Amino acid sequence: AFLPSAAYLTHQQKVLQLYKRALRHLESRCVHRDKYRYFACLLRARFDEHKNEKDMVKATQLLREAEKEFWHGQHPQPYIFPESPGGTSYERYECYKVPEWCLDDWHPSEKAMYPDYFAKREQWKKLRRESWEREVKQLQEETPVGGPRTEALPPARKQGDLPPLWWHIVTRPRERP
Amino acid sequence: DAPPLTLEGIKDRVLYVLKLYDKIDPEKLSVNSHFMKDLGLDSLDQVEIIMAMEDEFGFEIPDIDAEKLMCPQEIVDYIADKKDVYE
Amino acid sequence: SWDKDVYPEPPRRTPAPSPQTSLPNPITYLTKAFDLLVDRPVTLVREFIERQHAKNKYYYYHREFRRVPDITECHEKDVLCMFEAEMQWKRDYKVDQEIVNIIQERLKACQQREGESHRQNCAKELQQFTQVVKAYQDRYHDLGAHYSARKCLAKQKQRMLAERKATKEAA
Amino acid sequence: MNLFSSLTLVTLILLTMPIAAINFNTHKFTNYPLYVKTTISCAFITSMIPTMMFIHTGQEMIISNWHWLTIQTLKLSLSFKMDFFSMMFVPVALFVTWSIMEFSMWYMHSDPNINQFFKYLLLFLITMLILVTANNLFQLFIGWEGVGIMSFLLIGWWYGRTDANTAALQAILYNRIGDIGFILAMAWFLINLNTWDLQQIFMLNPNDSNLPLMGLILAATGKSAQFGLHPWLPSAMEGPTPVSALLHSSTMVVAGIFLLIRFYPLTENNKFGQSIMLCLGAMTTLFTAMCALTQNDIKKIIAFSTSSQLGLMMVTIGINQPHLAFLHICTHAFFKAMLFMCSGSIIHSLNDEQDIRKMGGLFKAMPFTTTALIIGSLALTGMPFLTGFYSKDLIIESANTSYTNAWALLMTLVATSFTAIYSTRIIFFALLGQPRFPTLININENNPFLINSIKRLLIGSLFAGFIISNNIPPMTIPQMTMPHYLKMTALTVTILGFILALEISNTTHYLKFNYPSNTFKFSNLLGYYPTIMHRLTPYMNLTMSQKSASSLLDLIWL
Amino acid sequence: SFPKYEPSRLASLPTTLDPAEYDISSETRKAQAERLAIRSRLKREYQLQYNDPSRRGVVEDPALIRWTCARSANVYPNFRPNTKTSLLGALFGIGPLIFWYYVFKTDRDRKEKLIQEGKLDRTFNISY
Amino acid sequence: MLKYIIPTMMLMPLTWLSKNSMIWINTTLHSLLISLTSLLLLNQFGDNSLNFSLTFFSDSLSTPLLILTMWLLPLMLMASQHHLSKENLARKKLFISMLILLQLFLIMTFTATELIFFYIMFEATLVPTLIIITRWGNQTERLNAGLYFLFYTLAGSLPLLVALIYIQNTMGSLNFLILQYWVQPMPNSWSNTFMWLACMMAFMVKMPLYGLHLWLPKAHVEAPIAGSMVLAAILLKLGGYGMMRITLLLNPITDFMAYPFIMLSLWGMIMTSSICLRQTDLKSLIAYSSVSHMALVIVAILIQTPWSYMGATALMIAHGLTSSMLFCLANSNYERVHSRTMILARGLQTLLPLMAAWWLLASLTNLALPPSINLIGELFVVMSTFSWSNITIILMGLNMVITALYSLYMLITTQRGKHTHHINNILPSFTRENALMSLHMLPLLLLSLNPKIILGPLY
Amino acid sequence: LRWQEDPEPEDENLYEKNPDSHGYDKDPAVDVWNMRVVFFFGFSIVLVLGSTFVAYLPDYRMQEWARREAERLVKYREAHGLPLMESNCFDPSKIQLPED
Ligand SMILES: CCCCCCCCCCCCCCCCCC(=O)OC[C@H](COP(=O)([O-])OC[C@H](O)COP(=O)([O-])OC[C@H](COC(=O)CCCCCCCCCCCCCCCCC)OC(=O)CCCCCCCCCCCCCCCCC)OC(=O)CCCCCCCCCCCCCCCCC
Ligand SMILES: CCCCCCCCCCCCCCCCCC(=O)OC[C@H](COP(=O)([O-])OCC[N+](C)(C)C)OC(=O)CCCCCCCCCCCCCCCCC
Ligand SMILES: CCCCCCCCCCCCCCCCCC(=O)OC[C@H](COP(=O)([O-])OCC[N+](C)(C)C)OC(=O)CCCCCCCCCCCCCCCCC
């Protein structure tokens, strides 16, 4: 459907995701824990009844009317985790997630308030800038003709090098600033 | 409020959940025990284990990551990634 | 203060304090504390300021405009006289506006001061307000934003034609 | 006299002094939230003296102290109306706000913008006491738009979150649709009565007052979340908990109800306005209480609770009983602020968990929170001789015994039962039973800020109805003669609601899985009203704002 | 059996209940792989400029520039006056103007006729 | 008025004889001194206007537009000095000279005793504005706007010229003071109908009118910041000033010739406000907001009640300040991200908190938050149009919803949400930029204390 | 190929060479004195003394006089029994209507 690595969903992935969404919407339907745990083993039995189905077209049809079953029996407001998308605390602290380059725009009177921090940030940036051209020339010889096929990136191969396209993943803001 | 998570704490809690699971014996369970190949579980059981992690720690692991967590060490490393432990 | 005729205030009737219960109210103690802590220092500072007012007594005056000829006895297209008529008419327009504002202040203060018996006890102020609003409407309504003494005279002449025709059709 | 007006203005100037303090800052603060809480405590103490010397004599006045403008017949002066409504609302609002800020010094402690939060909350309090003390329509419009804009700024507090900005713009939209009617009322009174002052409106006493009262009813619809313009009050739970506690339960959302209570000599001589208020209030108190039966977010459930109580306030205005409605405002503030504070204490204890389906077992874990939540729910439902009994039951004792729309009365009683239903639903899923929250218990409430802040509103929710209703003078005649099946109406309907919802709650322990009914899908998706109109009315605007407005006409043809 | 979900303009069909999502054919593999390839190439072309330290500024997005140029500039030079454009520019162009014209003219003629017949309550109406 | 024209002209030897690093400081200082001098025009009277000479006069309509004009020059010199830093010194002095010449034209456009001197100065203001927009506009793509300027010259200023020469032959004068006392009623005839269109359509395009607003979201976009400031703040208000002068002669035919154009504005503010909900370009959004606010001034002049003129001149002053501040905020982001796309740079309250406070205040004045003079003008126009027709409140109030809707959307898009990742040149706020925002906003907030000086000649 | 063209100049940062830059100029002494000129002749001169000037305007458009004059005239015609305002602005005796 829409994924970074694969261009599709395998049938095994579709079965597992439908099982998970069915259990989550079921737990939304079935608030109490022993009651949900009873119906959860019942639903696990219903999913393991046709676990050993060899015919992929028949399993496709069974998965399709299982999606119809799940859509007919879904909860209108299922339990979303608070920091899950659709939750009450979701993306709440994104107004506190200042990007790191703004530290470069500080005045030197407040840069001198934290001397060890910026004295270490200088060699962090030094590390980034002497890693950049090596990881660019790493990516230019491994990428096939026509660009990269999948969005996944190779790791650091040599010893001493850093993995390519790493600075915004490493220096990302904390989830609770 | 909001107590700090540690890799000792995340490790001990993930293993504490998996030792309360009736298809994993508490004597063969290690920190690198693979779910399908070493503990002999199903992908259905693996989805139930990742949903038990979601029940344990109070957040959600998406399915593109839930389809690949195949040891307790990957679970501890993923929660370390999504919680920023050992500051 | 001000003039008690243009701003009339009927004689105040307060009841006497009639303490029936033995529990002492907080309001007398707070009134004495306000009289000591607040009224006295403010009053002393005001007396100092008023002594300094007395150390230089100087006066200002209310400007008077003697009545110039109005728009009726000014010639047509003679701007030297009808300018004077227009300035007189505009000063009278703003003064009539402030007369209406004085009658509104009377009506609002009567309504609050009478409280719940405002409908019974403010019939005279409501009557004066109806008369002054009828007068101001007959004199200055519907002129437009480019109002002048000529517009007001033409409205007065149309109203006088209507009143004369209404007098004629009654006989 | 010189005490009353002086301390009246001292209260408002004292509330404005920390705004000058936070704007004239150079240092980092020696606990500016404690400074604002101390200031609002002392402003409460200051406003207590004019209230006591109003209860002594009935002393009302007007302070038209500063002449501001004169548009040819309209002298707009800075004019403060100290009547019964201000003398009962200002101490209640300052007391509730003082408890909300001692709550916020605990709840909002992790926020690095805590000084901006207390600044915005004080700005809201200033605009609200501008609203409830204004003597002309213009100063009331100042306070009206002020509480609308501080509602915007306090819904969108976590401004990075898309849903908070969406809910804030939604609330601004519905409030400006109410402002259409408010400006309609100002336009009618200026043209037909030559005034925005209340005194000249009341003294002239017009008879063809259907159109300004329709404008005021549309204004109260936009402001008090009545039906048609309601869903922003459930959407506005995306802001922080003391925001929803102070503003959107007890203080801001009563301002449309306060606008209609303020204009009672026009409504008491217009039966059509009374009938429209009765129908709209009964529709809202039915609909929001029905939507509250099948929700799972606790802030949503208590927001539907406060909107159903606002609909009941609109009902008891619509039976020409405005002073009972205002007594219900002053009563409702205490226990509804306390219910939001206890719900947020549960939320902060359970690590930002708001969904009631992951709560439970909190009777002995959070004992003080459980005690105060039960007391707030019982004051909401109409337990005998709590504070909510001293107004709401009397509302029913005048809703039965009056020349009333019969279906409005029947929907009022269905709402009275539904209040008991969602109250014991909150107590069932959140306090009773066995736990459902995750495994790392960080449950704690032992801060004197939280405990004292819930404690003072607890003293309010126990004693304040008795104290106020024995300190207010009669302004109507209380209808006290009725048959015994009619006197026992509200209590029996409330207990029937408790019994029906306890049977519903004990059908959930059964090991059965039923398919969802159409009533459940209707009430859970909010009467389908925020699902359709929030999609359709923007769509039909914005395509029309692009295809024909921008592209076709104003880039090609014209 | 079950109620089938009805899609709408503002209620789209889900990904799960669409049948063409369950295509297994190799031409769908080719289309999905080419979409993944274009998306991966554009992702790489973005985050080589994004993660560059020597760049300090705005990674300009020509799709965004192209979108704004379509929403502003391309409106007139691809216009052709035909039946559809003229009728839709006459419906929403001079329609509601005529509507509010006759509504306000009707109400003002009514109010003027009531004022010159002494009917309209213009008693305390001295601000205007 | 000659104590204002001569210092404005002495700003030319002040700007050409100044040292190369001193030409912004000197012109800003002496234009602020002229703006302090500009308060002597507040010697107004309740009956008589302030009549200086045969050539110049000032009632309470022209006086606040004069104070706003003389105040706008230092703000334009502050706003336009950053993006002219790499400019040639002589070209920089040419820019400052065109700004000074535009102020010189405006301050004797508003005081013009006679109407053809008003016409000469009125059409004289277009030339330095034209040169500022097309020599410093940073891109010029005007393939459709040439034909529209031809339409402005054909349907606008030239029939006004022929009509004013006709009044000069008929009345014998075009002194507005003489025309106060020698005005004849303009009756119903076809000659008087074309007379009304000739007297009004130039000022209709200058406001602008809906349907005739096609120039304004182009000329605001293709301009420098000083050009957009003077277009939003003053150059639209020449149309309203000229309408309030020329509608003296157009009675009583206005009482039935206003009915089309009133519709064009009453529906028009419903459309352009809605157009602001679908703007990709922030500067175009502020342009369509300017159209949506000047529609009310068109209606308030055409219904010619006292409350409508008071609200219209208060709305003109307030919208001048507010929309000038909005264009300056749009430039304070454009000088960083180098694109006017409103969805490009988001979440800016995370990065610039004081500048987001200025965005919040300019949005609240844009959506007419009371007691600001935006709301006072808006409100008095709404009261007067309710006296015109009781249904129009709907078209007022619906506008007053949508005017709120795009005002906060402009706040929510640019300042709230998640910040854009690939933009890292977002510098902190320069003290120049914050000073520019404060010199817009603090006069606009102080005028709420004493609004009687911006309510026109019939307050 | 296309013509001989100078490349696009990069946007300079005024904080690099001068971290105390107010943004008025790149020369720091010129920048600070531009700041002092803008702040003194803008805020200390025009806003403060301008608000002081406007606040003490000598009865802007004679409103206060017109109230006090009204406080004369009402007092003149409450006492003499006259109505407070006539319905005719001018004397109806000095007006000649068109006959019919
Ligand atoms: C003639 C003498 C007069 C003396 C009295 C003064 C009269 C008014 C003057 C101007 C008032 C505003 C000044 C501050 C705002 C602009 C600067 C700013 O943003 O500063 C933030 C900053 C504080 O924030 P920060 O944390 O330090 O940094 C910014 C944050 O990063 C990020 O910021 P943030 O988001 O955290 O906080 C921003 C916050 C955001 O808050 C809001 O947006 C809420 C505002 C709207 C709702 C509440 C108000 C509703 C209306 C009711 C109140 C008005 C009527 C009251 C009367 C009684 C009832 C009728 O704004 C405020 O707190 C501003 C408070 C005042 C707001 C006024 C209304 C603005 C709304 C739009 C117009 C409304 C109608 C017109 C009102 C006119 C009033 C006269 O303030 C300062 O540093 C102060 C600087 C110095 C201010 C001087 C003021 C006077 C200037 C005039 C000079 C000439 C006369 C001499 C007098 C000198 C007196 C000292
Ligand atoms: C710490 C701060 C306090 C100051 C400490 C230092 C001074 C010590 C205290 C003493 C002060 C001096 C003596 C008292 C003050 C002077 C009294 C006096 O007569 O002043 C003249 C006047 C009184 O008005 P007036 O009636 O005399 O004249 C009005 C002017 N005309 C007639 C031309 C229209 O002004 C004041 O008092 C000004 C203060 C007003 C206070 C409220 C301001 C609110 C501003 C809101 C703006 C928007 C309004 C919108 C709403 C409008 C209504 C709907
Ligand atoms: C004007 C047209 C051009 C527009 C642009 C202009 C740009 C150039 C600017 C030039 C300088 C400024 C000119 C306009 C000045 C306007 C201000 C002015 O003069 O006001 C006069 C007004 C005059 O008031 P007044 O009308 O009562 O004056 C009475 C007259 N005298 C003084 C002679 C007795 O000044 C004041 O009101 C000052 C009163 C004291 C200060 C204010 C106290 C209260 C303030 C609020 C307190 C907190 C409230 C709660 C807040 C809550 C949070 C929001």
Q: In which region does residue C125 sit, left (phi positive, over 0), alpha (psi from -120 to 50) or beta (all else)?
A: alpha
> Are F4 and F30 contacting, i.e. CB atoms less than 8 angstroms apart?
no
Burial category of D82 from C-beta neighbours within 10 Å (exposed 0-12, middle 13-18, buried 19 and up): buried
> Cβ F424–A96 below 8 Å, yes or no?
no
Q: How are beta strands D61-71 and D74-82 bridged, if at all?
A: antiparallel
Q: Using alpha carbons only, how large is chain C's radius of gyration in Å?
A: 26
A and C touch with 3+ CB pairs <8 Å, answer no
Q: How far is the CA of D118 from the centre of ligand 3 (A)?
A: 27
For residues F422 and F344, give the distance between their C-alpha atoms in angstroms, rounded to a whole number.
Answer: 10
> Cβ C87–F48 below 8 Å, yes or no?
yes
Asked whether the CA dihedral D238, D241, D243, D244 is positive or negative, the reply is positive
For residues D509 and D434, give the distance between their C-alpha atoms in angstroms, rounded to a whole number.
Answer: 11
Burial category of C63 from C-beta neighbours within 10 Å (exposed 0-12, middle 13-18, buried 19 and up): exposed
> Are F239 and F313 contacting, i.e. CB atoms less than 8 angstroms apart?
no
DSSP of F413-449: HHHSSPPPTTB---PPPPHHHHHHHHHHHHHHHHTTT
> Cβ A97–F350 below 8 Å, yes or no?
yes
Asked whether the CA dihedral G24, G25, G26, G29 is positive or negative, the reply is negative
Nearest to A91 by CA among B69, F380, F418, F379: F418
For residues F323 and F288, give the distance between their C-alpha atoms in angstroms, rounded to a whole number.
Answer: 11
> Are F403 and F292 contacting, i.e. CB atoms less than 8 angstroms apart?
yes
> Cβ C136–E122 below 8 Å, yes or no?
no
DSSP of A76-93: SS----TTSTTSTTTTGG
- Experimentally, the structure was elucidated by cryo-EM
Phi first, then psi: give them for residue D79, nearest 5 degrees: -130, 120
For residues D123 and D119, give the distance between their C-alpha atoms in angstroms, rounded to a whole number.
Answer: 6
Q: Which of F370, F401, F416 sits opposite D142 (nearest CB)?
A: F370
Gaps after residue numbers in chain E (C–N over 2.5 angstroms): none
For residues D530 and D233, give the distance between their C-alpha atoms in angstroms, rounded to a whole number.
Answer: 12
For residues D170 and F401, give the distance between their C-alpha atoms in angstroms, rounded to a whole number.
Answer: 11
Burial category of D160 from C-beta neighbours within 10 Å (exposed 0-12, middle 13-18, buried 19 and up): buried
Reading the block at residue E84, the tokens are 């559809």
Alpha carbon F350 to its chain centroid, in Å, reads: 32
Q: Which of F47, F182, F305 sits opposite C87 (nearest CB)?
A: F47
Reading the block at residue F155, the tokens are 């349907």
For residues F321 and F325, give the distance between their C-alpha atoms in angstroms, rounded to a whole number.
Answer: 6
Q: Using alpha carbons only, how large is chain B's radius of gyration in Å?
A: 12
Phi first, then psi: give them for residue F341, nearest 5 degrees: -75, 125
Residue of F nearest to D556 (CA): F214
Nearest to D184 by CA among D218, D208, D207: D218
> Are D307 and D426 contacting, i.e. CB atoms less than 8 angstroms apart?
no
For residues F330 and F286, give the distance between their C-alpha atoms in angstroms, rounded to a whole number.
Answer: 9
> Are A174 and A145 contacting, i.e. CB atoms less than 8 angstroms apart?
no
Q: N- to C-terminal Cα distance for chain E?
A: 68
For residues C86 and F345, give the distance between their C-alpha atoms in angstroms, rounded to a whole number.
Answer: 59
CB neighbours of residue C23 within 10 Å:
6
> Cβ F452–D160 below 8 Å, yes or no?
no
The answer, yes or no, to whether the previous bond of F208 is cis (omega within 30 of 0) is yes
Which residues of B are designated catalytic?
42
Phi first, then psi: give them for residue G87, nearest 5 degrees: -80, -10
Q: How many residues does chain C have?
A: 171
Q: Which of B13, B55, B58 sits opposite D351 (nearest CB)?
A: B58
For residues D422 and D376, give the distance between their C-alpha atoms in angstroms, rounded to a whole number.
Answer: 13
Nearest to D109 by CA among D118, D121, D96: D118
For residues A25 and A70, give the distance between their C-alpha atoms in angstroms, rounded to a whole number.
Answer: 9
Judged by DSSP in three states, F50 sits in strand
For residues D153 and D143, give the distance between their C-alpha atoms in angstroms, rounded to a whole number.
Answer: 15
| Angle at CA of residue F265, ends F263 and F270, nearest 5° | 100
Residues of A in contact with G15 (CB under 8 A): 105
Alpha carbon F179 to its chain centroid, in Å, reads: 27
H/E/C letters for each residue in D71-97?
ECCEEEEEEEEECHHHHHHHHHHHHHH
Protein residues whose CB sits closer than 6 Å to any atom of ligand 3? D 16, 19, 123, 126; F 64, 67-68, 71, 317, 321, 443, 446-447, 449-450, 453-454; G 46-47, 50-51, 54-56
Write down the residue that tokens 């549960």 correspond to: D346
For residues D189 and D211, give the distance between their C-alpha atoms in angstroms, rounded to a whole number.
Answer: 10
Reading the block at residue F181, the tokens are 């006392």
For residues F115 and F172, give the distance between their C-alpha atoms in angstroms, rounded to a whole number.
Answer: 12
Nearest CA to ligand 3 atom 54: D123
> For residues G10-45, b (16+ Cβ closer than 10 Å) or e, as one string?
eeeebbeebeebbbbbeeeebbbbbbebbbebbeeb
For residues D345 and D342, give the distance between their C-alpha atoms in angstroms, rounded to a whole number.
Answer: 5
> Are B18 and B72 contacting, i.e. CB atoms less than 8 angstroms apart?
yes
| Angle at CA of residue G35, ends G30 and G37, nearest 5° | 95
For residues D535 and D526, give the distance between their C-alpha atoms in angstroms, rounded to a whole number.
Answer: 14
> Are F326 and F337 contacting, i.e. CB atoms less than 8 angstroms apart?
no
The full set of domain ranges for chain B reads 1-87
Alpha carbon C83 to its chain centroid, in Å, reads: 28
For residues G89 and C156, give the distance between their C-alpha atoms in angstroms, rounded to a whole number.
Answer: 7
Residue of C nearest to F300 (CA): C145
Reading the block at residue F150, the tokens are 């031809």
> Are D235 and D208 contacting, i.e. CB atoms less than 8 angstroms apart?
no
**Contact residues, chain A to chain E, C-beta under 8 Å:** 1, 6-8, 18, 56, 60, 63-64, 67-72, 101, 125, 128-129, 132, 136, 139, 143, 146-151, 165-168
SS3 content of chain D, % helix, strand, coil (to 5): 70, 5, 25
**Contact residues, chain E to chain F, C-beta under 8 Å:** 46, 49-50, 56-60, 64-65, 67-68, 71-73, 76, 96-97, 100-101, 103-105, 107-108, 111, 125, 127-128
Q: In which region does residue B83 sit, left (phi positive, over 0), alpha (psi from -120 to 50) or beta (all else)?
A: alpha
Question: What is the DSSP-derived secondary structure letter of residue D61?
Answer: E
> Are F2 and F56 contacting, i.e. CB atoms less than 8 angstroms apart?
yes
Sequence-ordered list of residues with C-beta below 8 angstroms from that of F18, at least 6 positions apart, any chain:
F26, F27
DSSP of chain E: -PPPPPP-SSSPPPSSS-GGGG---HHHHHHHHHHHHHHHHHHHHHHHHHS-SS--SB---HHHHHHHHHHHGGGSTT----HHHHHHHHHHHHHHHHHHHHHHHHHHHHHHHHHHTT-S--SS----
SS3 content of chain A, % helix, strand, coil (to 5): 55, 0, 45
Residues of B in contact with D110 (CB under 8 A): 1-2
> Cβ E72–F337 below 8 Å, yes or no?
no
Write down the residue that tokens 């001789």 correspond to: D385
Burial category of F125 from C-beta neighbours within 10 Å (exposed 0-12, middle 13-18, buried 19 and up): buried
For residues G5 and C22, give the distance between their C-alpha atoms in angstroms, rounded to a whole number.
Answer: 100
Alpha carbon A14 to its chain centroid, in Å, reads: 17
For residues F47 and G59, give the distance between their C-alpha atoms in angstroms, rounded to a whole number.
Answer: 13
SS3 content of chain F, % helix, strand, coil (to 5): 70, 5, 30
CB neighbours of residue C43 within 10 Å:
10
For residues C92 and C99, give the distance between their C-alpha atoms in angstroms, rounded to a whole number.
Answer: 10
Judged by DSSP in three states, F71 sits in helix
Side chain identity at residue G96, one-letter code: Q
- Which helix (H) or strand (E) segment holds residue D309: the answer is helix D298-318
Question: What is the DSSP-derived secondary structure letter of residue D515?
Answer: P
CB neighbours of residue F215 within 10 Å:
19
- Resolution in A, one decimal? 2.9
**Proximal ligand: closest to the CA of G64:** 2
